[PDB]
Design a protein around this ligand. Structure first.
Ligand code: HEM
Ligand code: HEM
Ligand SMILES: [Xe]
Ligand SMILES: [Xe]
Lengths: 191, 191
């Protein structure tokens, strides 16, 4: 029901598999305990998803060199572009929470990588905009994406310890995903 | 006095400048306030640097697909490789704390990127080892590098809020650096 959202119906197999994923879970110190807590993160954020997106887009719109990546060629924000991506972004909050990180998940990670990269940016929504998001910012955004989240994890009044556990699980999953999304950016053989 | 440590004597200008740096700072939400806590972070960690490195190498050593990047071709850890890098790693804890992030700093960021990449890996210490560290792990390590650090920031018995501030400043600086280190990995024009 979400236009452009193709989880489980992607054209490509990811170039990484569940063996790659396990080693790389290990590199970010992600275990079964984080599965439980990322899932608990979802139940807690699910309600608040609108406010979260406003927090996030309000940080994005605040910074012209960041808003830039949603702009029409004339410099003005493409509002169709913003609204469509927003729906798919909101769904990723829940996917990160609720999906098995199996091969269909990996296939979508690869896809999300391709859509930030020049390979597939601007094709999902059929818009004219900047061709590529500099990978430097994909990495940088790990910070605000985790930050932005933490206050929201506190709002159903969970213990600070449980909030800390959901925040760490989230920090790890975001780091894990951004690391996968670098594939189409990274010189072949260097990934 | 630290062999291979060439901060301020690198042979290349970085391909990024202080204008690039200001916009990346902004992407990771790093401000003057973080300057004052990263500097505080240094005073707090300075003492404990031995123990920190043991924690970090003990995480590295316990994962064979991670230890791998310090191995001789026969699979055994190169001990002359580990010890030399350890000295330069320990200095980076203090550089991140104390340096002005100016052009000489950026030039060294580029260098550190080059040394993880095939471009320069294994030349500093004149060792034979694996040619390249897959960028996926540079990104992944943002997590353990921040997590490792947090307990150490608590040890001089600072209040949790000051500890929270030093930890965030550290999370941001590590994210900022790893984003810069991706340069030699990323397809030209995609950075
Ligand atoms: C932690 C880093 C990031 C996360 C977690 C993230 C998250 C997302 C998600 C979930 C989508 C929707 C994917 C889909 O189902 O189609 C998306 C698309 C997009 N994001 Fe990001 N993103 C990150 C970095 C960035 C950065 C640095 C920018 C620059 C402002 C950005 C701007 C965009 C744009 C323009 C699209 C649409 C791309 C296209 O045309 O398909 N993202 N992002
Ligand atoms: C947040 C991510 C990382 C940080 C903060 C970091 C930190 C450092 C530092 C400060 C140095 C010394 C640079 C110098 O002055 O020469 C170094 C070198 C090195 N690190 Fe990392 N590193 C990261 C990712 C990784 C990963 C994923 C590995 C894989 C185990 C790794 C293994 C190595 C190796 C093998 C060298 C020596 C490279 C050479 O031959 O010059 N690092 N790293
Ligand atoms: Xe977010
Ligand atoms: Xe560390």
């Amino acid at each position: 029901k979400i236009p452009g959202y193709t989880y489980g119906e992607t054209e490509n197999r990811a170039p990484f598999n569940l063996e790659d994923l396990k080693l790389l879970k290990e590199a970010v110190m992600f275990t079964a305990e984080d599965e439980e807590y990322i899932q608990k993160a979802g139940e807690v954020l699910e309600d608040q998803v609108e406010e979260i997106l406003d927090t996030w887009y309000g940080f994005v719109g605040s910074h012209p060199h960041l808003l830039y990546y949603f702009t029409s060629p004339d410099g003005t924000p493409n509002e169709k572009y913003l609204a469509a991506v927003r729906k798919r972004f909101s769904r990723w909050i829940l996917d990160t929470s609720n999906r098995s990180y199996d091969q269909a998940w990996l296939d979508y990670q690869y896809e999300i990588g391709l859509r930030h990269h020049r390979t597939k940016k601007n094709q999902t929504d059929n818009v004219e905009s900047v061709p590529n998001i500099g990978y430097r910012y994909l990495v940088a955004f790990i910070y605000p994406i985790t930050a932005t989240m933490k206050p929201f994890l506190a709002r159903k009044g969970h213990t600070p310890e449980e909030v800390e556990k959901m925040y760490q699980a989230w920090f790890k999953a975001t780091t894990l995903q951004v690391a996968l999304w670098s594939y189409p950016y990274v010189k072949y053989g260097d990934f």
